[PDB]
């Protein structure tokens, strides 16, 4: 019941000038083909991912990764999965209570001295390339009563997204299958109705702010994508394929927070990224106790929440 520092493991090779592979070969140890899971003696333990300490560790690691690699100096990179293992006396525990919301007790508490395959992908509004939900879709927050506390949604159907810049110098589009997104959004709407005493749910675009949180912001092929996501939160539902307008930016308020960046224009050629909408970042509109509705807008909180979504079961403890 303590918090310590850990090291990382990597399934990467140091022969190609990647910015994740060469970073992880020296910053991390190669994966150890030695997995030992121990389903504990049917013990029930209380977890709390919102006060987890490994998320800070991973945050430092991604900060160092970006700072060391990116310079205004152009090379293709990819998010290779990162493992996080721990020395002796300091051990990690895992929860496998099927549908866990990340803050209560767990019964089939496993035990492994290292994490699972986790790729450090940064994104806003929508969590990409994540791990699906096992049985249902999960609503996670310190408690939904507080509007300041963020809300994470674990989807049990990974939705496909396809962002593409063709060979019209910085424009791009991102195609999704509208029917699947509408279906899963209706399921999340039903579950929030359940969670809010059969309350009416409304989905709306963000009230305002910078482009990073206003739009779906991520990075693919080394180029920073911002996508206008008003179509997905079209509360009226549209049944066909949805094209999402997107643009590559060369000023970026750095994701850690240091000013506005400056980068070269994107490399010539086609830029394609097919990825997995796996989670949703939401903020509930505050106030309005008397009103019979609950309005939700996407995107919010730190980038730490992206890692905490994947770290919602593991917990470091003493031996």
């Amino acid at each position, epitope marked *: 019941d303590a918090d310590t520092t850990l090291f990382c493991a990597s399934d990467a090779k140091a022969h190609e000038t990647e910015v994740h592979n060469v970073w992880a070969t020296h910053a991390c140890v190669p994966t150890d083909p030695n997995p030992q899971e121990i389903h504990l003696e049917n013990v029930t333990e209380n977890f709390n991912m919102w006060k987890n300490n490994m998320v800070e560790q991973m945050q430092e690691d991604v900060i160092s990764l970006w700072d060391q690699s990116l310079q205004p100096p152009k090379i293709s990179f990819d998010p290779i999965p990162i493992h996080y293992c721990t020395p002796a006396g300091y051990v990690i525990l895992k929860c496998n209570d099927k549908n866990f919301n990340g803050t209560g007790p767990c019964k089939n508490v496993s035990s492994v001295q290292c994490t699972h395959g986790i790729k450090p992908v940064v994104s806003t509004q929508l969590l990409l390339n994540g791990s699906l939900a096992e049985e249902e879709i999960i609503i996670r927050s310190e408690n939904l*009563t*507080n*509007n*300041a*506390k963020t809300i994470i949604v674990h989807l049990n159907k990974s939705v496909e997204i396809n962002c593409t810049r063709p060979s019209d110098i910085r424009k791009a589009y991102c195609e999704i299958n509208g029917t699947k997104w509408n279906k899963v959004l209706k399921q999340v709407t039903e579950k929030l109705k359940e969670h809010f005493n059969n309350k009416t749910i409304i989905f709306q675009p*963000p*009230s*305002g*702010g*910078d482009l*990073e*949180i206003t739009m779906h912001s991520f990075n693919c092929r080394g180029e920073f994508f911002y996508c206008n996501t008003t179509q997905l939160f079209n509360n009226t539902c549209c049944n066909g394929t949805i094209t999402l307008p997107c643009k590559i930016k060369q000023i970026i*308020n750095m994701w850690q*927070g240091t000013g506005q960046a400056m980068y070269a224009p994107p490399i010539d050629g086609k830029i394609n990224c097919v990825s997995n909408i796996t989670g949703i970042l939401l*903020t509930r*509109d*505050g*106030g*309005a*106790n008397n*009103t019979s509705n609950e*309005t939700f*807008r996407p*995107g*919010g909180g*730190n980038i730490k929440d992206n890692w905490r979504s994947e770290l919602y079961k593991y917990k470091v403890v003493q031996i």
Partner: antibody
Framework: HVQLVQSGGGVKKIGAAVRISCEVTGYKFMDQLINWVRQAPGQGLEWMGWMNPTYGQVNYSWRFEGRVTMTRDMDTETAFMELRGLRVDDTAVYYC?????????????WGQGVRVVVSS | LTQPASMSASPGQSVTISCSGTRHIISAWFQQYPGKPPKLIIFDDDKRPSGVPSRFSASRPGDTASLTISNVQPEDEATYICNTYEFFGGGTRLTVLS
């Protein structure tokens, strides 16, 4: 010690728009969301909204959407609130606030309040 | 949520302000003076920060939080506000009988 100062109030006519500032002193401005709250004369406190000073994520109440906006300035290390199309009932004392290091509520630290009077 | 508009107390007595509604969302209490911004005096229902005397206590055993003041003195003539999250009560204008 942390402290928040506000000095952008006064008297304005109907319609129009008002800009209200709040400057922080004693903590990392990037953290700790900033709340915009209002107290009417001889009435109770009414929370308009909050704003994140990182990239500017805001969250307004249902009674001010479209009317109120919130912005920030990092080197100034200050927050701005714009209220346009004011009404006479908008006559009130206006506060910026924030809570502990543990996120937002409750509001341990308040500003000083500025009087805003909507007149003819 | 719901607070009485005003109360009345002679010096040295004990009074109790009751904020119902709540919805079990914890409780915090502010004392506010004319012109001055609200000043938090009770947080986490039954806890008080430094500088708050022993006369002030509070308890939220349900959806009806309550703030008790013992041996009222001239500091206490102010407006007392219950709050849960972003929601505040209408204020109770406690007035000592001068």
């Amino acid at each position: 010690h942390v402290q928040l100062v506000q000095s952008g109030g006064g008297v304005k006519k109907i319609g129009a728009a008002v800009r209200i500032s709040c400057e922080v002193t004693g903590y990392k401005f990037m953290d700790q969301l900033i709340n915009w709250v209002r107290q009417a004369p001889g009435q109770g406190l009414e929370w308009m909204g909050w704003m994140n000073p990182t990239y500017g994520q805001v969250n307004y109440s249902w009674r001010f959407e479209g009317r109120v906006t919130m912005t920030r300035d990092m080197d100034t290390e200050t927050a701005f609130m714009e209220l346009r199309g004011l009404r006479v009932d908008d006559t009130a004392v206006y506060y910026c606030a924030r809570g502990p290091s543990g996120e937002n509520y409750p509001f341990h630290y308040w500003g000083q309040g500025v009087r805003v009077v909507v007149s003819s | 949520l719901t607070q009485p508009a005003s109360m009345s107390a002679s010096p040295g007595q004990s009074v109790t302000i009751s904020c119902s509604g709540t919805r079990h969302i914890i409780s915090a209490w502010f004392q506010q003076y004319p012109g001055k911004p609200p000043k938090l005096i009770i947080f986490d229902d039954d806890k008080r920060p430094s500088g708050v005397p022993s006369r002030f206590s509070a308890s939220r055993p349900g959806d009806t939080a309550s703030l008790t003041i013992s041996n009222v003195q001239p500091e206490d003539e102010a407006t007392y506000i219950c709050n849960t999250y972003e929601f505040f009560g209408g204020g109770t204008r406690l007035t000592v009988l001068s």
